[PDB]
Amino acid sequence: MNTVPFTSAPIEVTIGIDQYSFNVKENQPFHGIKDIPIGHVHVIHFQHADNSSMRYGYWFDCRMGNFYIQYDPKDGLYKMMEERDGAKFENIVHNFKERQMMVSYPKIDEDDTWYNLTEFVQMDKIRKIVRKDENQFSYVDSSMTTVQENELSDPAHSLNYTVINFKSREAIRPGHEMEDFLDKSYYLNTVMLQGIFKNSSNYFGELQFAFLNAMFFGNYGSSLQWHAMIELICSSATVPKHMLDKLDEILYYQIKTLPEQYSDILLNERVWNICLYSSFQKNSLHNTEKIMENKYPELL
Amino acid sequence: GAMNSSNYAELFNNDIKLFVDDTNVYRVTVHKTFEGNVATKAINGCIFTLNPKTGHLFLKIIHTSVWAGQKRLSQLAKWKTAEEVSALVRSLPKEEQPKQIIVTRKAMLDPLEVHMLDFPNIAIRPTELRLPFSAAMSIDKLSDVVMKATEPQMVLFNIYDDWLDRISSYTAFSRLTLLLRALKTNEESAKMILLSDPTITIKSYHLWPSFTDEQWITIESQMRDLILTEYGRKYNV
Numbered sequence: 153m154n155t156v157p158f159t160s161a162p163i164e165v166t167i168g169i170d171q172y173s174f175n176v177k178e179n180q181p182f183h184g185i186k187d188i189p190i191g192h193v194h195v196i197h198f199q200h201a202d203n204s205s206m207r208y209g210y211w212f213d214c215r216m217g218n219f220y221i222q223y224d225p226k227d228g229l230y231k232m233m234e235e236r237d238g239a240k241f242e243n244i245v246h247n248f249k250e251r252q253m254m255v256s257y258p259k260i261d262e263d264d265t266w267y268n269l270t271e272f273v274q275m276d277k278i279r280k281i282v283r284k285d286e287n288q289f290s291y292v293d294s295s296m297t298t299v300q301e302n303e304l305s306d307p308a309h310s311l312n313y314t315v316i317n318f319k320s321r322e323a324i325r326p327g328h329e330m331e332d333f334l335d336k337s338y339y340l341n342t343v344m345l346q347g348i349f350k351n352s353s354n355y356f357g358e359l360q361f362a363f364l365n366a367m368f369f370g371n372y373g374s375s376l377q378w379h380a381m382i383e384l385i386c387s388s389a390t391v392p393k394h395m396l397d398k399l400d401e402i403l404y405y406q407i408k409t410l411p412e413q414y415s416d417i418l419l420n421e422r423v424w425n426i427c428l429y430s431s432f433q434k435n436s437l438h439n440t441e442k443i444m445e446n447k448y449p450e451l452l
Numbered sequence: 453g454a455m456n457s458s459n460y461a462e463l464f465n466n467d468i469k470l471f472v473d474d475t476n477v478y479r480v481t482v483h484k485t486f487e488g489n490v491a492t493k494a495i496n497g498c499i500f501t502l503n504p505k506t507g508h509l510f511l512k513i514i515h516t517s518v519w520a521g522q523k524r525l526s527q528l529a530k531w532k533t534a535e536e537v538s539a540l541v542r543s544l545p546k547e548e549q550p551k552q553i554i555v556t557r558k559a560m561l562d563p564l565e566v567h568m569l570d571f572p573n574i575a576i577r578p579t580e581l582r583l584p585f586s587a588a589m590s591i592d593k594l595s596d597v598v599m600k601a602t603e604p605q606m607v608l609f610n611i612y613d614d615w616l617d618r619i620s621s622y623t624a625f626s627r628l629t630l631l632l633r634a635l636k637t638n639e640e641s642a643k644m645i646l647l648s649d650p651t652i653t654i655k656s657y658h659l660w661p662s663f664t665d666e667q668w669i670t671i672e673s674q675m676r677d678l679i680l681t682e683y684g685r686k687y688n689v
């Protein structure tokens with residue numbers, strides 16, 4: 153189990169750690185989060201009490217370094233930093249655990265939710281979507297745009313998700329116009345899986361990361377990416393059976409975790425009704441269709 | 453974006469543009485089988501691709517053999533239309549290629565867009581106008597060449613004859629759509645109107661009769677009467 157220590161909490165803030173969240177009051181004696189499960193990526197995120205504008209946060213993996221949070225009064229945000237002095241880190245943290253000034257990552261033993269949301273998400277791949285190579289952790293906020301959004305404006309602050317565009321020469325083989333537009337298997341299997349992602353694990357990792365950025369930061373371009381990646385599979389007649397079964401599990405846990413009150417802005421009615429009721433894979437997502445119909449029947 | 457009555461004179465500016473109408477591409481008769489089921493028999497069709505400024509009509513005749521062994525023909529017909537329009541554009545010198553293609557049915561937008569990805573500078577546009585181009589097969593010399601075809605064929609027609617010698621493109625297009633609206637609302641009446649007087653002929657090199665300027669005003673009035681009239685008989689007013 154690992155620890156993310158806080159210099160202090162000078163401004164009132166709601167702090168998220170993965171799917172959990174808690175309120176810290178202005179100048180409250182808070183010095184961080186302990187008992188963080190090793191083996192998974194994590195996200196620590198923030199929404200200030202005064203300005204709910206800009207949810208922001210940091211993706212990290214405690215196996216890759218010792219990280220802490222310190223408020224910056226000039227830039228006005230909680231910043232993640234890496235402590236390279238391992239002995240100092242050890243000495244400073246033990247004191248906060250002794251003075252009991254940290255919240256415990258509150259995982260229920262039965263609970264596989266976080267694993268099931270991040271199964272294919274790797275820090276190395278996150279760091280290629282979010283380019284800032286001098287840090288081992290990655291900053292994301294509500295406002296960041298995607299490379300594809302910039303093509304339709306600061307390239308350094310972009311989410312470099314894989315561009316998916318169903319009416320593009322990449323997606324459509326000369327002479328197979330109708331075939332390739334109506335059945336996206338070529339684009340999914342040859343262009344995307346064999347050519348760009350190399351395997352379905354990397355595809356699912358990006359799909360899961362996009363969902364999590366949409367849910368935790370309200371990042372609109374991430375929501376677009378998540379739906380595009382779902383639609384590309386559902387609109388393919390030829391999809392490996394293990395991929396369809398895994399996608400059904402992935403989406404099931406995403407839909408289960410989605411806050412009920414955010415469904416209207418995070419779920420695209422057209423994509424879900426097409427995928428579940430019209431697409432080639434309309435009969436292949438049993439778990440996802442069942443939870444969607446019981447939790448969000450209005451959307452359908 | 454979409455073409456409507458607000459931007460109607462844009463059709464007659466000097467940017468090359470084509471209308472594409474696909475309503476006569478896939479044509480069938482429906483009939484009973486010996487077992488008392490129903491079956492279709494396809495007949496030859498055509499793509500109606502028209503330059504509204506010049507009157508040049510690229511009539512691609514769709515021979516029934518193109519449907520042999522194919523499924524979901526109504527969907528295929530849209531993609532076949534887009535394939536042939538794309539092939540036509542590529543066949544034209546760069547300086548003759550259109551800047552815009554306006555489809556008369558919104559269901560042609562995605563098929564044409566996908567086929568023209570190579571041409572990102574050609575705009576594919578819908579229209580809100582309810583243009584009567586389906587009635588093109590009511591023109592005698594066009595229906596004849598379509599029904600006689602034994603193989604795929606393109607014939608280049610001018611649907612304005614020599615009207616542009618005497619009137620503007622705007623007025624020619626208005627006359628054309630009035631004639632076609634009439635043929636679509638009541639084909640027999642419309643055709644009676646156009647051919648009643650045996651001293652007004654259709655030249656061997658013309659599709660429509662050789663009306664004087666004055667006779668065209670009479671004809672045009674009779675067509676508006678017809679369209680208003682059948683706007684009565686249909687709706688009882």
Ligand SMILES: Cc1ccsc1C(=O)NN
Pocket residue numbers: 157158159220221222235240241244245
């Ligand atoms: C809060 C904290 C914990 C580990 S290092 C650190 C600090 O203030 N400077 N590194």
Ligand SMILES: Cc1ccsc1C(=O)NN
Pocket residue numbers: 593608609610611612613614656657658659
């Ligand atoms: C090309 C052709 C053949 C018979 S009439 C005709 C025509 O378009 N006249 N304007």
Ligand SMILES: Cc1ccsc1C(=O)NN
Pocket residue numbers: 633637679680682683686
């Ligand atoms: C009878 C008639 C004449 C001009 S439009 C029209 C019609 O039925 N539109 N739906």
